[PDB]
Design a protein around this ligand. Structure first.
Ligand SMILES: [Cl-]
Ligand SMILES: [Cl-]
Ligand SMILES: [Cl-]
Ligand SMILES: [Cl-]
Ligand SMILES: [Cl-]
Ligand SMILES: [Cl-]
Ligand code: NA
Length: 129
């Protein structure tokens, strides 16, 4: 599924991400835009051999099991393929764990490089929330 901007903001808001650990909704929407272009099916390989999965590009190095990332962890206790559903629940619940771990949203490289310190409210402008 490729979410619309306001469609995803609303889904994210329903799932409790608005101001989760102090990150406004616009941060999460911005992160998803640059991580996946709002595409729940997005997958990208990392140089180390891990893979990033889904709308928030959750990494098999630490967070999910894909059976082909030697040495990795599965801290969200989920198969990586479950993070590719058109329902964003699994991705959001794992994202809550990631963002609580110490680094906040700096865990998402795209957030840090493209969203952090910018006018993130623009991403929810005009949306019924
Ligand atoms: Cl915002
Ligand atoms: Cl593995
Ligand atoms: Cl959903
Ligand atoms: Cl889900
Ligand atoms: Cl923080
Ligand atoms: Cl607004
Ligand atoms: Na893993």
């Amino acid at each position: 599924k490729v979410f619309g901007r306001c469609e995803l903001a609303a889904a994210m808001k329903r799932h409790g991400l608005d101001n989760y650990r102090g990150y406004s909704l616009g941060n999460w929407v911005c992160a998803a835009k640059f991580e996946s272009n709002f595409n729940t099916q997005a997958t990208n390989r990392n140089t180390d051999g891990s893979t990033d999965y889904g709308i928030l590009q959750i990494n098999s190095r630490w967070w999910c099991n894909d059976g082909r990332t030697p040495g990795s962890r599965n801290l969200c206790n989920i198969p990586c393929s479950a993070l590719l559903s058109s329902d964003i629940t699994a991705s959001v619940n794992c994202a809550k764990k990631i963002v609580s771990d110490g680094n906040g949203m700096n865990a998402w490289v795209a957030w840090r490089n493209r969203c952090k310190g910018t006018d993130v409210q623009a991403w929810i402008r005009g949306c019924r929330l």
